[PDB]
Amino acid sequence: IKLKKDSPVGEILTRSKYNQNSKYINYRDLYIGEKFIIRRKSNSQSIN
Amino acid sequence: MNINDNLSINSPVDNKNVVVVRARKTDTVFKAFKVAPNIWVAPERYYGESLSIDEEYKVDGGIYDSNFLSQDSEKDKFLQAIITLLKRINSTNAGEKLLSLISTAIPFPYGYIGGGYYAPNMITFGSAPKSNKKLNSLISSTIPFPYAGYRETNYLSSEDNKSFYASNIVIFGPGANIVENNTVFYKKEDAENGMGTMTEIWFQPFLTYKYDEFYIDPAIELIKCLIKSLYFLYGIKPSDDLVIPYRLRSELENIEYSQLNIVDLLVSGGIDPKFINTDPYWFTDNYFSNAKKVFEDHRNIYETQIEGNNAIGNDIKLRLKQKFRININDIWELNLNYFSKEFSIMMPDRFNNALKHFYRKQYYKIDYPENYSINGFVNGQINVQLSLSDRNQDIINKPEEIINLLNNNVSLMRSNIYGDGLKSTVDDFYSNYKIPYNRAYEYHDSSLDNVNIGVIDNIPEIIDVNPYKENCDKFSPVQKITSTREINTNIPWPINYLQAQNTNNEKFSLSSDFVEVVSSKDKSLVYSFLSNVMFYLDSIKDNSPIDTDKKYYLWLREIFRNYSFDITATQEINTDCGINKVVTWFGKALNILNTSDSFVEEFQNLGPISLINKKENLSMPIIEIYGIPMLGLPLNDLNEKLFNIYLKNILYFKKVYFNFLDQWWTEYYSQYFDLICMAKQSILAQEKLIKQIIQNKLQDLFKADISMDKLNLMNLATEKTFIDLSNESQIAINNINDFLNKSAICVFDTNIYPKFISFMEQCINSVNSNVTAFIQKCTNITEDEKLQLIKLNTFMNIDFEFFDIQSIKDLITSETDLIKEEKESDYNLFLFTLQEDNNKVIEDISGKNTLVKYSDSISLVYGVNGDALYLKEPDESVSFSNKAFENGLTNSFSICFWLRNLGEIITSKLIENKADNCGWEIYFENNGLVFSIVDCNGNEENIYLSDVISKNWYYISISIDRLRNQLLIFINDKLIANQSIEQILNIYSSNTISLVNENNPIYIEGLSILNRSITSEEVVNNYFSYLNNSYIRDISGERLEYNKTYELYNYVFPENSLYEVTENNNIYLSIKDTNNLNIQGAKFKLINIDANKQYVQKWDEGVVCLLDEEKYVDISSENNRIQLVNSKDTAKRIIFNNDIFMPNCLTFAYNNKYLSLSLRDRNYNWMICNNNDNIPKAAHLWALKGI
């Protein structure tokens, strides 16, 4: 997911793949797209 | 893309959509209809094959009828059927993409007459008039003289040879053989050079066969034919001599291998192509390289000569641009497995190209306006009600072998065995194939992505076609003659045993002696391995005749029970590959390991390899291990070279492992699949025998003095018992499948892998020696460096061990298996309720689509773990309709739901499915429920289940298992009744069960009806998992909520409510004494930081409020007792939780210490923050009761 350049929506793009040196290894990047975060709503329970 | 569905055989010849064209260059003409760009339909039969075929040349399994598709009505029906199939295909994205690719994929056009594809010559036209001063001779327009000069080879010629119409595909009717779908090309030469050619298709949509438990959708066959045609369109057809082994002809007494073309395997899908087409590729040929090179050459030609040219129409240019957008690998990777997942269509997945040998097909007639729609088979692929065709009596049967069992030398029985019909090869293929090294030494649902439907739809149609003079060569009919051998023997073969289980007489008798059955002159005996059924039949023999419906019901129940016990019998044994559920009766059927003693006993003291009659079929493949070449280099650079060689050798060692796996599949798993097919044929034979016995008995009974109503009830009970027997037989089939598949896998593990290891162990030495020699031949390196490198670049055994038992299991699993798993359910009704936004929806989601009729007055509330039906207004009714609810005589089921009664306790019906007297009922009576089940013969069984007082949540789970005649009733998580219903006969009641309130408001949640009995473990697990929802509940069972007034109880004392006591100028909570047990209990309140929050959740932190001065809970620091302080600032922040196995009781915590009671202290039991271990762990569990 990547935030749209103009619209206030998240566009869906395709993950990158390893294409550096070796044909014996293949994987798709993970640390891409918007950085999400989960925030407690009510903050009722202890913050510990 | 839009399929023209507005055509009929009577449509006028408009020379634009309906045409009369010529068949190749012969003297015949035929009528064609265009349903899409470059796609035509010709209902008449194919002109090539001659309708009259001599009996010698007829092939096995074929239907011949020269009068089919001769009348106009049949032609119109065929055309409409083809259009319906095309619409069904195009209804899905994959079908639309495939059809667009077919339309755009025109054969490559030939160059100009002179040659080349670059540009035409120029001409000038229209000299201007002589002006006053200037002659103006040269002022004229310029024209490309041969516009659209590109010569095309895809065109149908009119009868007059003066007009031509574009066409890529032409769907004809069946040829000489009524049931044989085929795809043939126009020019063989153009189908292999990459230019391409038009394709002709023979299709028969009016006949289909039943495989396993489902029917075959002709759309899949049409898609297969279209995919095969795609090869012709792209001109990438491989040579006919490029075949591969497909199956080992075990039945023969010789080493013969059946062969299949590469295109057929790549297109037909299934599991066979998975063993081939691996990563890395172990099978390769120059065909792929040549095809890729030619495709690249043609793409370059288009990109450098076609795109630039401005003197040719876009009809060809744009289509060619899209034709080359896709890659050849996409076509090679395109098979039926993708469309099966996309369309959710079941198809044969193992050896689907050689099904003629495994089992004989029965054909059913399809009425397309009715049985098949744009959404597929009406009522699904399983429940479609078709009629057996009348042409089944004309099926040709030419066996490949005729087993003549003898005995001294008198033929007792004569069985027929049929071949696969594929090309054979005596020469061993695996032993003469060289897995190549310097080829494919790398590469250790996205095939049709590049197709753009919109652009194709935007292409203008082709109007003017410049024809190639010679685009049709001729048609060569293929004539085949089937041989027939006679293999005499004295040991009965499995096919003989299978044939012994079929009969024609309607008054036969079961027997267990095969020799006695075959020697029977009267032919009144039939061989069966059902020991229990025959023993029971012999037991009742010579008893009172069956006259009363009670006797008939008992007889049928016993027969069904015995048949199910016998068919589903299994014995678990400990194998190396875990535990296998062997089939006890697999020996008596098929005559395998039937020499003596138990079949399981032999199967344990002898490997699973013993089942098959042709072992030791492996052959070592040819190995070419090239040695390392040389020039010196430093360790830094030489290291990368050696690493690459190491990886290449690892890949080669896989290529070999894959070759051995394919050998196992072709030579060993084929025999086990044949055994599976033979076994599931015996089960159906036994089912037919039992059904015929039941029908004979019912017919005999009908000639008695019994009322018509009772006879109709008996007939309906028999009809339901037939479905029950079918379910039991399907369970047996599943058991057989699992057992034999596991046996084959473990056979590979214990009989082939060691040989592969042994063979490579003798090859790793050569690689190691070559590497050592090359390393020693290098000068620029230190001796220690050489030693380290040798230690690194050496192969141990574990370096070429690739066995992965789970990968094999996932390799023999097809999309059909996944679909069956997804479509398998044990629920006849699984209620789903959602409130949405004023759009309440209640419906069944089990897949049985039960008709639910509910009044709008109903409401939905959160009962336990979701929305729950709330019947409040009097005279509210909910009804669920389904045929399966009729129950019957032999069928086990169960009801399960959650109930809460908010009323009182007069008698009141709750749920029923009664018809006068037969059926089952549930109703409140006294302070509890009652469950009543009654049969149509007066036998009753009413059970009273106590402790169902109002204002409490209860979990009712009732089970009826007719295999054990056992009735289980659970409430909450306890067993209340285990009665026996051996005297309860048919309870055939009705198709709808009504749920009513009758002045008592009620919450009903999670209603579920299962088609099987349940176990105590299942009930306990479901009860405790449903309540694990992160919500804390009161003692009643309702969600606990803040600001509500409650009373506090301790689990140890469930009748004592805590009250405040003043001691030493302090207030503590204590328990009422025995004498003074009349004081009103204290009332509590739960506060939270987020006052908006209403419903309590686990781990929530809050403050306990006690009611005049609005007291609050604090923990005394002097005695650890809980005291009360009139200030929220000093009050402690308690944490609320609960135990999973005590759902309705909660626990308080502070500083990770549970609040609990204390031992007696002069008539008191204080609430404390306990740390001692001498207090029972049940004393820190509390309950809150609504006040």
* One-letter amino acid of A19: N
Q: Residue-wise over B49-77: b if at least 16 C-beta within 10 A, else e?
A: beeebeeeebbbbbbbeeebbeeeebbbb
CB contact under 8 A, B1101 and A45: yes
Closest CA in chain A for residue B280: A24
Cα-flanking dihedrals φ and ψ of residue B938, to 5°? Answer: 100, -20
Cα angle A23, A28, A33; round to 5: 150
**DSSP of B406-434, one letter per residue?**
E----EEEEEEE----S-EE-S-SGGG-E
End-to-end CA distance of chain B: 69
Compute the distance between CA of residue B785 and CA of residue B789 in angstroms, rounded to an integer.
6
DSSP type of residue B216: P
Interface-testing mutation among B1100, B1137, B1152, with chain A (most A C-beta atoms within 10 A): B1100
CA distance B78 to B636: 72
CB B859 within 8 A of CB B872: yes
Q: Both tokens of residue B452?
A: 């753009």
Other residues' Cβ atoms within 10 Å of the Cβ of residue B1078: 6
DSSP bridge pairs for B435: B623
Q: B221: Cβ–Cβ under 8 A, 6 or more apart, which residues?
A: B181, B203
Tokens 């082939």, located at residue: B752
Question: CA distances (Å), B440 to each of B273, B278, B280, B326, B419, in order?
Answer: 18, 11, 7, 22, 36
Pairing of strands B401-406, B485-489: parallel
The reply to whether residue B444 touches residue A23, judged by beta carbons under 8 angstroms, is yes
**Residues in Cβ contact with B1157 at an 8 Å cutoff, skipping those fewer than 6 apart:** B1050, B1052, B1053, B1071, B1165, B1166, B1167, B1168, B1175, B1179, B1180
Is A17 touching B (CB cutoff 8 A)?
Answer: no
Q: What is the 3-state secondary structure (H, E, C) of B461-522?
A: CCCCCCECCCCCCCCCCCCCCCCCEEEEECCCCHHHHHHCCCCCCCCCEEECCHHHHHHCCC
Q: Indicate the pairing of strand B841-844 with strand A2-3.
A: unpaired
CA distances B895 to B183, B1000, B1006, Å, are: 54, 21, 10
Give the type of residue at B674: D
Does residue B348 contact residue B270 with C-beta atoms inside 8 Å? yes
Amino acid in the structure at residue B1023: Y
Return the bridge partners of B942, or none: B932
**CA max distance for chain B:** 141
DSSP run (H or E) holding B76: helix B72-90
Chain centroid to CA B701: 42
List CB contacts of B287: < 8 A, sequence separation 6 or more. B238, B239, B242, B262
What is the rounded distance in angstroms from the CA atom of residue B429 to the CA atom of residue B52? 38
Scanning the structure block, which residue is given the tokens 């051995």?
Answer: B660
Nearest to B1141 by CA among B1005, B971, B1014, B1025: B1025
Place of tokens 């192509």: B273
Task: Check if A42 contacts B (Cβ < 8 Å).
Answer: yes
- What residues of chain B lie within 8 A of the CB of A40, using their CB? none
Please indicate whether, in this complex, the C-beta atoms of B444 and A24 are within 8 angstroms of each other. Answer: yes
Please measure the distance between the N-terminal and C-terminal CA atoms of chain A and give it in whole angstroms: 32
Smallest CA–CA distance, residue B1097 to chain A, in Å, is 10
Q: Which helix (H) or strand (E) holds B958?
A: strand B953-961
Tell me the three state secondary structure of residue B40: strand
Residues of B in contact with A44 (CB under 8 A): 1088-1090, 1093, 1100-1102
DSSP state of B798: G
Residue B570: strand pairing partners = B583
Residue corresponding to tokens 């990770």: B1152
Q: H/E element holding B773?
A: helix B753-777
Cβ separation A44–B1102 shorter than 8 A: yes
Return all residues near B157 (Cβ < 8 A) that are at least 6 apart: B21, B22, B163, B164, B467
> Is the Cβ–Cβ distance between B945 and B929 less than 8 Å?
yes
* Nearest Cα to Cα of residue B656 among B758, B730, B788, B556: B758
Other residues' Cβ atoms within 10 Å of the Cβ of residue B622: 12
Q: Is B390 exposed, middle or buried (0-12, 13-18, 19+ CB in 10 A)?
A: exposed
> In this complex, do B1100 and A44 lie within 8 Å of one another by their Cβ atoms?
yes
* Cβ-contact B646, B793 below 8 angstroms: yes
The label of the residue with tokens 């089921």 reads: B893
Contact between B1151 and B1117 (Cβ < 8 Å): no
Rounded CA gap, B592 and B252, in Å?
A: 18
Distance between CA B486 and CA B411 in Å, rounded?
12
Residue that has been written with the tokens 């006919």 in this structure: B240
Alpha helices in B181-285 (DSSP H): 188-192, 218-234, 262-268, 272-275
Instruction: Judge whether B24 and B475 are in contact, CB under 8 Å.
Output: yes
Q: Which of A25-44 are b and which e, b meaning 16 or more Cβ less than 10 Å from the residue's Cβ? A: eeeeeeeeeeeeeeeeeeeb
A46 touches chain B (CB under 8 A): yes
* B353 closest CA partner among B244, B453, B456: B244
Residues B52, B56, B58, B61: is their CA dihedral positive or negative?
positive
HSE-CB at B660 with a 13 A cutoff on CA atoms is 23
Phi and psi at residue B547, to the nearest 5° = -125, -35
Find the angle CA(B166)-CA(B48)-CA(B205) to the nearest 5 degrees: 75
Q: Are B890 and B957 in contact (CB under 8 A)?
A: no
In the chain, the amino acid numbered A30 is: L
Which chain B residues touch A45 with a CB distance below 8 Å? 1099-1101, 1135
Distance CA B430, CA B440 (A): 19
Neighbour count for residue B389 (Cβ, 10 Å): 20
What single string gives the DSSP state of each residue in B964-986?
Answer: TTEEEEEETTEEEE--B-TT---
3-state percent breakdown (helix, strand, coil) of chain B, nearest 5:
30, 25, 45
Please name the residue that has the structure tokens 């203008």. Answer: B460
Beta bridge partners of B899: B954, B1004
Length of chain A (residues): 48
Burial of B623 (0-12, 13-18, 19+ CB in 10 A): middle
Cα radius of gyration (chain B): 40
Reading the block at residue B613, the tokens are 């009659």
By the 10 Å C-beta count (0-12 exposed, 13-18 middle, 19+ buried), B802 is classed as middle
| Residue B11 burial (C-beta neighbours within 10 Å; 0-12, 13-18, 19+) | middle
Are B1093 and A44 inside 8 Å of each other by CB?
A: yes
Q: Are B943 and B971 in contact (CB under 8 A)?
A: no
Distance CA B664, CA B53 (A): 40
- Rounded Cα–Cα distance for residues B898 and B971 (Å): 10
Q: Which of B441, B442, B444 to probe the A interface (max A CBs under 10 A)? A: B444
CA B1121 to chain centre: 63
B202 touches B48 (CB < 8 A)? no
Residues of A numbered 18-37 whose beta carbons fall under 8 angstroms of chain B's beta carbons: which are they? 23-24
Q: What is the DSSP string of chain A?
A: -EE-SSSSSEE--PPPB--SS-SS---B--S-S-------SS--S---
Q: Taking a C-beta distance cutoff of 8 angstroms, is the pair B1126, B1105 a contact?
A: no
* CA distances, B94 to each of B223, B265, B775, B861, B1156 (Å): 11, 21, 55, 43, 65
DSSP code string of B846-880: SSS--EEEE-TT-EEEE-SSSEEEEE-STT-EEEE
Contact between B533 and B689 (Cβ < 8 Å): no
At B807, phi and psi to the nearest 5? -65, -40
Cβ count near B933 (within 10 Å): 23
- Verify cis geometry, omega within 30 degrees of 0, for the bond prior to B280: yes
Identify how the structure was determined: cryo-EM
List Cβ neighbours of B935 (8 Å cut-off, separation of 6 or more): B918, B984, B985, B986, B987
> Which amino acid type is present at position B415?
S
Point out the residue among B442, B647, B1099 whose CB comes nearest to the CB of A45: B1099
Distances (CA, A) of B984 to B727, B966, B981, B988, B1014: 22, 11, 5, 11, 19
Residues A16 and A29: their CA atoms lie apart, in Å, by: 6
Distance CA B664, CA B746 (A): 12
Question: Tokens 């296998």 label which residue?
Answer: B580
Phi and psi of B284, rounded to 5°? -150, 155
Helices (H), B344-452: 355-358, 368-371
- The Cα B914–Cα B931 span in angstroms is 12
Q: Please list, in sequence order, all residues whose beta carbon lies within 8 angstroms of the beta carbon of residue A31, skipping any fewer than 6 positions away.
A: none
In angstroms, the CA B826 to CA B1008 distance is 10
Of B443, B444, B1088, the CB nearest to A44: B1088
- Amino acid letter, B407: N
Q: Are B1136 and B1096 in contact (CB under 8 A)?
A: yes
The amino acid at B1080 = Q
Identity of the amino acid at B258: S
B562: enclosing H helix or E strand: helix B549-567
Closest CA to B117 of B159, B150, B95: B150
Please report how many Cα atoms fall inside a 13 Å half-sphere around the Cα of residue B1089, on the Cβ side.
Answer: 13
Give the pair of three-digit tokens for residue B652: 């080669």
The DSSP secondary structure of B138-204, one letter per residue, reads: T--EEEETTTT--BBS-EEEBTTSS-EEE-SEEEE---SSSS--EEEES-HHHHHSSS---EEEE--
Helices (H) and strands (E) in chain B, counts: 26, 56
Give, in order, the Cα–Cα distances in Å from B852 to each of B35, B863, B997: 42, 21, 17
The residues, any chain, with a CB within 8 Å of residue B601's CB and separated by 6 or more, are none
Distances, alpha carbon B620 to alpha carbons B627, B796, B892, in Å: 21, 21, 54
Closest CA to B372 of B85, B76, B178, B73: B85
- Report the C-alpha gap between B983 and B909 in whole angstroms: 25
Q: Which residues of B touch A42 (CB under 8 A)?
A: 1089-1090, 1092-1093
CA-based nearest residue in chain B for residue A23: B443
* Backbone phi, psi, residue B1137, to 5°: -150, -165
Cβ–Cβ under 8 Å, residues B870 and B1001: yes
Buried b or exposed e, range B222-244, using 16+ CB within 10 angstroms: bbbbbbbbbbbbbbbbbeeeebb
